């Protein structure tokens, strides 16, 4: 009910001022009864120019607009795999406890609201809160902090008792034995009750509902969320389906949604009913089999270190799994990728590592040792030469293909004997071709292009019409860099083209020179 | 608790509310340990949720720091703190000195209170692994290290503290940037280090070589026989250099390049081109004329990765008008760690940016933000933290400055 806790000072937003619908005789009666009660319990107090509309519900929407800002409540959630397996784990639902914490007397005023009278223009009944009001801005923020202090002592008192705060939740684990543990929860409840923090009549139990997760004792299982099978698929429905489908692809490696997505193409409304294709019916079905299957995981045991192994589900598609004991995974996930303007697999491999590394540091405060699909020479050959600062923490090469590697490598020096193609292309349509040293020549008129494309096609053709070894000199700094970055995938089909071709050769030397200049060869195409 | 001056924020501006990046457990440990002491020593004190501000906090291990040192990122705050007058002037000399030594004196600040009305802004937070508990948030009651307002307020006392040595030895210069103290003298190795010690004594009781930093020149290739490619590359760099030295001529060369020849093909040099190089070589022997520091403009420091552990940099304020250029070679052991080398470089550059101009340059880093943010602190060893932005090195800027003192 009420508490003897050091209230906290609440101010209105920088230089602002504090913030009733007509009701039914029935809604009035009901609301007056509720309030006289809510009054007595020592929560509200009859009384002030302010007012918030009561619907029982109170619309602080405006109050809150006019209330200060607090320290970010932190919308970052603890993840099961970050829990340390414990002999015992009670969970207390504190929730209603905020109505137990006092409100900064001064502020209270604003909270004022009104209860309508039948005969309007007759004083309705006015009140205001004395403790954190459900619906108010600082309530959550404040109640937490309160709690945190109220534990503090106790957390020091008994160190082996591990507590977790989270909204209206208080997960308490320990390695104490049953009745031994039991009694501790008992003392905590009291400590809390010794302040006004009352706890349940309907005590929560072992298999736990971590939004999506099923938290069991010393392990966790995934509470299989089903696929609403039907034969009338609305747009909304196929989306929501892809939504849960994708959530799944993470802990269930195997889910695919290509064909289900296709169903979205051209759609003209949410309610539209899209008939599933054959491949849709199959995929969507082979996915009903995976989801049936339940997946279990372990917990963090500081005693044994962390390990992460990754793999490529497809170009720029990564699957990882973090574990302490082989086949005993702590967590797993997938990174379907962007398909950047101009990337490469090794680089991409890198960004996968980087997130993991961060993800870990949160969950464990430590980073994992890495098992990865790449030759150390490959890594080496690449990173020591790329123009960008890059790195992978401690790792080892795992040989479980497909391996990620260097689809190609431009030469460091011109190829002797190999042919030489001086290429160039170029208005707001165009042309682009080449003239080798050994006679050969081409050109092509392009309908609907831009300077870029042309240049590129130039280089493209150059590669088409050449042997397994070619020397190509060009003047597109843009083309140059792109390529010189030896990328194995891009946004540009054309670029894609070139990559194809580039891969195709046994040796390719790219050279670049400044345009418009009299640079021979360069001035011919020019 | 002597007295506090009523510092404020730049008009209109508001307190920092920066995300506390994710931290390793151990770091957290150290922090927490560190922070409790200071708490009980009255330096800092826990705050509520009513304090919406925040600044990042990390923990680092300096040279001899075999134990963790606490580091805070007041850069955002610093940017919002009303300017200051009592701020130390630049002794354009330490640069010219024979040798320098840096000194961490932030400690000094704890003994001076901070206005009760400003404290809310120094709010920083110690996060808990996997969000078991909210973070542990404090505030500062004293002058925090890493904040600009500090060395400013503790200026009067810094002079008092130093004159007995300053006044004593006027042949040695002492410069104070932020938490640091740059000490320079021409005395030989032992004769310097000893004096330092005396100075350390004075303070308790209460190395660099700016001479050898030669802004390197560019040197063109010089083989005995030239290929088509060889010219082409050369010509490319020259055509670029023209943006610094317009006298650079590349005509007598672009001639040697007409006809569609194998790149591998050898070409003999015309006596004009022979001179053209000669003439270009000479133009390259010196820094472009008309380059003067403008203290009103920001100092920009760009860095390129030349590979094999090598790194090049140029501090400049206006493009192509470099105040200084340099190469940097990775530290011993740092082999497999690009991030370390870069973090090392950056420091060694902000080092000179201070010695020389007494202020930190804004960096342009050839690295992905995500990557950098994940690991720099792991090898940072300074009390200060410059400003940065990440970039995409143009292949030519790299090729050119690769030509510097790519030694003999």
φ, ψ at B27 (rounded to 5°): -55, -55
- Quick check: B88 and B104 in contact, CB under 8 A? no
In angstroms, the CA A272 to CA A237 distance is: 10
Token pair for A495 = 């670029």
Token pair for A360 = 């870990």
Give alpha helix (H) positions in A390-510: 451-464, 477-484, 493-504
Class of domain B294-400: alpha beta
Q: How many CB atoms lie within 10 A of CB B60?
A: 18
Of A8, A367, A420, the CB nearest to B50: A8
Query: In 3D, which of A57, A64, A63 has the Cα closest to residue A27?
Result: A57
Query: What would you measure as the largest C-alpha separation in chain A, in angstroms?
Result: 104
φ, ψ at B117 (rounded to 5°): -80, -15
DSSP string covering A236-282 = HHHHHHHHHHHHHHHHSTT---HHHHHTTTT---TT-BPPP-HHHHH
CATH of domain A301-407: 3.30.70.270
What is the 3-class SS of A357-388, one letter each residue? HHHHHHHCCCCCEEEECCCHHHHHHHHCCCCC
Q: What is the resolution of this structure in A?
A: 2.8
Instruction: Tell me which DSSP letter residue B390 carries.
Output: E
In angstroms, the CA B60 to CA B30 distance is: 10
Question: At B282, is the secondary structure helix, strand, or coil?
Answer: helix
In angstroms, the CA B79 to CA B13 distance is: 10
Tell whether B389 is within 8 A of chain A (Cβ). no
Chain A and chain B share a number of CB contacts under 8 A equal to 201
Question: At A428, is the secondary structure helix, strand, or coil?
Answer: coil
φ, ψ at B21 (rounded to 5°): -55, 160
The residue of chain A with its CA nearest to that of B49 is A71
CATH of domain A207-300: 3.30.70.270
Token pair for A265 = 């193409």
Handedness of CA A434, A435, A436, A441 (dihedral sign): positive
Strands B362-365 and A419-425, by their bridges, are unpaired
Token pair for A229 = 């099978």
In angstroms, the CA A441 to CA A422 distance is: 10
- Quick check: A461 and A434 in contact, CB under 8 A? yes
In angstroms, the CA A140 to CA A148 distance is: 12
Q: How many CB atoms lie within 10 A of CB B12?
A: 6
Question: At B29, is the secondary structure helix, strand, or coil?
Answer: helix
DSSP string covering A384-413 = TTSSSB----SEEE---SSPP--S----SS
Token pair for A167 = 């909204």
Strand extents, DSSP E, B61-165: 69-72, 99-104, 124-126, 136-138
Question: At B345, is the secondary structure helix, strand, or coil?
Answer: helix
The residue of chain B with its CA nearest to that of A393 is B337
Tell me the C-alpha to C-alpha distance, in Å, between residue A136 and each of A45, A184, A350. 17, 33, 45
In angstroms, the CA A213 to CA A250 distance is: 13
What is the 3-class SS of B208-269, one letter each residue? ECHHHCCCCCCCCCCCCCEEHHHHHHHHHHHHHHCCCCCCCCCHHHHCCCCCCCCCCCEECC
Of A164, A471, A481, the CB nearest to B132: A164
Architecture of the CATH domain A408-518: 2-Layer Sandwich (3.30)
φ, ψ at A506 (rounded to 5°): -95, -25
Strand extents, DSSP E, A161-266: 162-166, 169-174, 208-210, 213-215, 220-222
Strands B310-318 and B300-307, by their bridges, are antiparallel
Handedness of CA A283, A285, A286, A291 (dihedral sign): positive
In angstroms, the CA B200 to CA B354 distance is: 21
- Quick check: A165 and B132 in contact, CB under 8 A? yes
Token pair for B114 = 């901070």
Q: How many CB atoms lie within 10 A of CB B338?
A: 25
In angstroms, the CA B231 to CA B276 distance is: 13
Query: In 3D, which of A436, A484, A435, A494 has the Cα closest to residue A460?
Result: A494
Query: In 3D, which of A253, A332, A340 has the Cα closest to residue A290?
Result: A253
Residues of A in contact with B264 (CB under 8 A): 414-417, 420, 471
* Measured CA angle at B313 (ends B297, B218), to 5 deg: 110
Of A363, A387, A471, the CB nearest to B305: A387
Burial B72-81 (b: 16+ CB within 10 A, else e): bbbbbbbebb
Class of domain B1-87+110-150: alpha beta
In angstroms, the CA A244 to CA A247 distance is: 5
Sorted by sequence, the CB contacts under 8 Å of residue A94 that are 6+ apart come out as: A147, A168, A169, A170, A192, A197, A199
Question: At A484, is the secondary structure helix, strand, or coil?
Answer: helix
The third-level CATH classification (topology) of the domain covering A1-73+99-139 is HIV Type 1 Reverse Transcriptase; Chain A, domain 1 (3.10.10)
In angstroms, the CA B305 to CA B365 distance is: 10
Q: Which long-range contacts (CB under 8 A, 24 or more apart) does B136-139 make?
A: B136/B32, B136/B35, B136/B46, B137/A71, B137/B46, B137/B47, B137/B51, B137/B54, B138/B35, B138/B39, B138/B44, B138/B45, B138/B46, B138/B47, B139/B44, B139/B45, B139/B46, B139/B47, B139/B51
The residue of chain B with its CA nearest to that of A162 is B132
Q: Residue written as tokens 């000490």?
A: B183
The third-level CATH classification (topology) of the domain covering B183-293 is Alpha-Beta Plaits (3.30.70)
Bridge partners (DSSP) of residue A172 are A90, A163
Sorted by sequence, the CB contacts under 8 Å of residue A473 that are 6+ apart come out as: A420, A421, A422, A423, A510, A511, A512, A513, A521, A522, B232, B263
Query: In 3D, which of A517, A475, A520 has the Cα closest to residue B257?
Result: A520
Token pair for B327 = 């190469």
CATH of domain A74-98+140-206: 3.30.70.270
- A145/B49 touch (CB, cutoff 8 Å), yes or no: yes
Token pair for B316 = 């400049």
CATH of domain B93-109+151-182: 3.30.70.270
Q: Which long-range contacts (CB under 8 A, 24 or more apart) does A260-264 make?
A: A260/A284, A263/A233, A263/A238, A264/A235, A264/A238, A264/A239
Strands of the sheet with A169-174, listed across from one edge: A88-92, A169-174, A162-166
Residues of A in contact with B227 (CB under 8 A): 414
- Quick check: B68 and B27 in contact, CB under 8 A? yes
Give the 3-state secondary structure percentages of chain B, helix then strand then coil, rounded to 5: 35, 20, 45
Sorted by sequence, the CB contacts under 8 Å of residue B127 that are 6+ apart come out as: B20, B22, B23, B28, B135
Tell me the C-alpha to C-alpha distance, in Å, between residue A35 and each of A6, A56, B195. 26, 9, 78
Tell whether A154 is within 8 A of chain B (Cβ). no
Q: Do domains B1-87+110-150 and B93-109+151-182 have the same CATH topology?
A: no
In angstroms, the CA A300 to CA A312 distance is: 26
Find the Cα–Cα–Cα–Cα dihedral B128, B129, B130, B131, rounded to 10°: 0
In angstroms, the CA B239 to CA B404 distance is: 16
Bridge partners (DSSP) of residue A310 are A320
The residue of chain B with its CA nearest to that of A68 is B50
Tell me the C-alpha to C-alpha distance, in Å, between residue A388 and each of A295, A406, A408, B347, B360. 40, 17, 19, 18, 23
Instruction: Tell me which DSSP letter residue A33 carries.
Output: H
Token pair for B304 = 């390129």
What is the 3-class SS of A63-129, one letter each residue? HHHCECCCCCCCCCCCCHHHCECCCEEEEECCHHHHHHCECCHHHHHHHCEEECCCCCCCCCEEECE
Handedness of CA A363, B378, A311, A348 (dihedral sign): positive
Burial B177-192 (b: 16+ CB within 10 A, else e): bbbbbbbbbebeeeeb
- B339/A391 touch (CB, cutoff 8 Å), yes or no: yes
Query: What would you measure as the largest C-alpha separation in chain B, in angstroms?
Result: 83
Query: In 3D, which of A474, A426, A463, A466 has the Cα closest to residue A446?
Result: A426
Positions of chain breaks in chain B, given as the residue before each break (C to N > 2.5 Å): 84, 206
In angstroms, the CA A43 to CA A282 distance is: 59
Q: Could you tell me how far CA B279 lies from the centroid of its own chain? A: 36
Token pair for A504 = 């195709």
Sketch the domain layout of chain A as residue ranges: 1-73+99-139, 74-98+140-206, 207-300, 301-407, 408-518
Query: Which residues of A, range 439-478, sit inside 8 Å of B by Cβ?
Result: 471, 473, 477
The residue of chain A with its CA nearest to that of B398 is A387
Query: In 3D, which of A349, A333, A290 has the Cα closest to residue A79?
Result: A333
Choose, out of B30, B47, B48, the residue to mutate when testing the contact with A (most A CBs < 10 Å).
B48
Tell me the C-alpha to C-alpha distance, in Å, between residue B116 and each of A202, A361, B151, B390. 48, 36, 18, 38
Tell me the C-alpha to C-alpha distance, in Å, between residue A500 and each of B138, B216, B317. 57, 42, 43
C-alpha distance from B344 to closest chain A C-alpha (Å): 13
DSSP string covering A273-341 = BPPP-HHHHHHHHHHHHHHHS--EE--B-TTS--EEEEEEEETTEEEEEEEEETTEEEEEEEEE----S
Sorted by sequence, the CB contacts under 8 Å of residue A58 that are 6+ apart come out as: A52, A113, A133, A134, A135
Q: Roughly what angle, to the nearest 10 degrees, separates helices B155-166 and B189-204?
A: 130
Tell me the C-alpha to C-alpha distance, in Å, between residue A245 and each of A106, A215, A380, B283. 51, 21, 38, 66
How many H-runs (helices) and E-runs (strands) does chain B carry?
11, 14
Find the Cα–Cα–Cα–Cα dihedral A487, A491, A493, A499, rounded to 10°: 0
The phi-psi region of residue B179 (left if phi > 0; otherwise alpha if psi is between -120 and 50; otherwise beta) is alpha
In angstroms, the CA B258 to CA B256 distance is: 6
Q: Do domains A74-98+140-206 and A301-407 have the same CATH topology?
A: yes
In angstroms, the CA A409 to CA A507 distance is: 8
Residues of B in contact with A514 (CB under 8 A): 235-236, 239
Q: Which helix (H) or strand (E) holds B181?
A: strand B180-185
Q: Which helix (H) or strand (E) holds B26?
A: helix B25-40
Question: At B326, is the secondary structure helix, strand, or coil?
Answer: strand
Tell me the C-alpha to C-alpha distance, in Å, between residue B218 and each of B32, B326, B401. 51, 11, 7
Sorted by sequence, the CB contacts under 8 Å of residue A421 that are 6+ apart come out as: A434, A435, A436, A440, A462, A465, A466, A470, A471, A472, A473
Of B229, B257, B304, the CB nearest to A520: B257
Query: In 3D, which of A219, A172, A177 has the Cα closest to residue A199?
Result: A172
Sketch the domain layout of chain B as residue ranges: 1-87+110-150, 93-109+151-182, 183-293, 294-400
Handedness of CA A513, A518, A520, A521 (dihedral sign): positive
């Amino acid at each position: 009910p009420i508490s003897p806790i050091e209230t906290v000072p609440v101010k209105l937003k920088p230089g602002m001022d504090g913030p009733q619908w007509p009701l039914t005789e029935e809604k009035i009666k009901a609301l007056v009864e509720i309030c006289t009660e809510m009054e007595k319990e020592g929560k509200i107090s009859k009384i002030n120019p302010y007012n918030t509309p009561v619907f029982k519900l109170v619309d602080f929407r405006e109050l809150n607009k006019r209330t200060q800002d607090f320290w970010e409540v932190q919308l970052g959630i603890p993840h099961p795999a970050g829990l340390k397996k414990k002999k015992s784990v009670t969970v207390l639902d504190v929730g209603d406890a905020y109505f137990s914490v006092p409100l900064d007397e001064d502020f209270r005023k604003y909270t004022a609201f009104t209860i309508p009278s039948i005969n309007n223009e007759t004083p309705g009944i006015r009140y205001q809160y004395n403790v954190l009001p459900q619906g108010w801005k600082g309530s959550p923020a404040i109640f937490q902090s309160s709690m945190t202090k109220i534990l503090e002592p106790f957390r020091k008192q008994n160190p082996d008792i591990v507590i977790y705060q989270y909204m209206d939740d208080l997960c308490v684990g320990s390695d104490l034995e049953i009745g031994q543990h039991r009694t501790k929860i008992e003392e905590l409840r009291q400590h809390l009750l010794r302040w006004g923090l009352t706890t349940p009549k309907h005590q929560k139990e072992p298999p736990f509902l971590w939004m999506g997760y099923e938290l069991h004792p010393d392990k966790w299982t995934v509470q299989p969320i089903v696929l609403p099978e039907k034969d009338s698929w609305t747009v909304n429905d196929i989306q929501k389906l892809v939504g849960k489908l994708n959530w799944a692809s993470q802990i269930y490696p195997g889910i695919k949604v290509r064909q289900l997505c296709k169903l979205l193409r051209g759609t003209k409304a949410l309610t539209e009913v899209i008939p599933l294709t054959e491949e849709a019916e199959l995929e969507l079905a082979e996915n009903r089999e995976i989801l049936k299957e339940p997946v279990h995981g372990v917990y963090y045991d500081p005693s044994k270190d962390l390990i992460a192994e990754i793999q490529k589900q497809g170009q720029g598609q990564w699957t990882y799994q973090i574990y302490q004991e082989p086949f005993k995974n702590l967590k797993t996930g997938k990174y379907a990728r962007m398909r950047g303007a101009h990337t490469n697999d090794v680089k991409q491999l890198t960004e996968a590592v980087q997130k993991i590394t961060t993800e870990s540091i949160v969950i464990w405060g430590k980073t994992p040792k890495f098992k990865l699909p790449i030759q150390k020479e490959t890594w080496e050959t690449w990173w020591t030469e790329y123009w960008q600062a890059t790195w992978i923490p401690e790792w080892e090469f795992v040989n479980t293909p497909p391996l990620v590697k260097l689809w190609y490598q431009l030469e460091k020096e011109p190829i002797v004997g190999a042919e030489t193609f001086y290429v160039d292309g170029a208005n707001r349509l165009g042309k682009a071709g080449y003239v080798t040293n050994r006679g050969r020549q081409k050109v092509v008129t392009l309908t609907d292009t831009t300077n870029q494309k042309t240049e590129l096609q130039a280089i493209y053709l150059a590669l088409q019409d050449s042997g397994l070894e070619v020397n190509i000199v060009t003047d597109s700094q843009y083309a140059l860099g792109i390529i010189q970055a030896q990328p194995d995938q891009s946004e540009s089909e054309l670029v894609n083209q070139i990559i194809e071709q580039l891969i195709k050769k046994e040796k390719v030397y790219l050279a670049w020179v400044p345009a418009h200049k009299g640079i021979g060869g360069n001035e011919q195409v020019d | 608790p002597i007295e506090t001056v009523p510092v404020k924020l730049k008009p209109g501006m508001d307190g920092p509310k920066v995300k506390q990046w994710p931290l390793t457990e151990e770091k957290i440990k150290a922090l927490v340990e560190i922070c409790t002491e200071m708490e009980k020593e009255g330096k800092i004190s826990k705050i509520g949720p009513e304090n919406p501000y925040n600044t990042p906090v990390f923990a680092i291990k300096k040279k001899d720091s075999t134990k963790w040192r606490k580091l805070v990122d007041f850069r955002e705050l610093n940017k919002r703190t009303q300017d200051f007058q009592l701020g130390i002037p630049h002794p354009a000399g330490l640069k010219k000195k024979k040798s320098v030594t840096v000194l961490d004196v932030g400690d000094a600040y704890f003994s001076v209170p901070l206005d009760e009305d400003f404290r809310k802004y120094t709010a920083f937070t110690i996060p808990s692994i996997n969000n078991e508990t909210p973070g542990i948030r404090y505030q500062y009651n004293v002058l925090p290290q890493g904040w600009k307002g500090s060395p400013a307020i503790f200026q009067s006392s810094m002079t008092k503290i130093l004159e007995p040595f300053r006044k004593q030895n006027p042949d040695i210069v002492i410069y104070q940037y932020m938490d640091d103290l740059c000490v320079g003298s021409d005395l030989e190795i032992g004769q310097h280090r000893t004096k330092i010690e005396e100075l350390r004594q004075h303070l308790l009781r209460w190395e660099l070589h700016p001479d050898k930093w030669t802004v390197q020149p560019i040197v063109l290739p010089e083989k005995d026989s030239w290929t088509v490619n060889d010219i082409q590359k050369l010509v490319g760099k020259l055509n670029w250099a023209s943006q610094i030295y317009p006298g650079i001529k590349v005509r007598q060369l672009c001639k040697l390049l007409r006809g569609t020849k194998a790149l591998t093909e050898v070409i003999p040099l015309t006596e004009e081109a022979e001179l053209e190089l000669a003439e270009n070589r000479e133009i390259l022997k010196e820094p472009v004329h008309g380059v003067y520091y403008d203290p009103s403009k920001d100092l920009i420091a760009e860095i390129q990765k030349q590979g094999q552990g090598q790194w090049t940099y140029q501090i400049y304020q206006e493009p192509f008008k470099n105040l200084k250029t340099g190469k940097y070679a990775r530290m011993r052991g740092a082999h497999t760690n690009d991030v370390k080398q870069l973090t090392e470089a950056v420091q060694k550059i902000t080092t000179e940016s201070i010695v020389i101009w007494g202020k930190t340059p804004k960096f342009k880093l050839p690295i992905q933000k995500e990557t950098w943010e994940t690991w720099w602190t792991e090898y940072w060893q300074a009390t200060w933290i410059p400003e940065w932005e990440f970039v995409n090195t143009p292949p030519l800027v790299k090729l050119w400055y690769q030509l510097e003192k790519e030694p003999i």
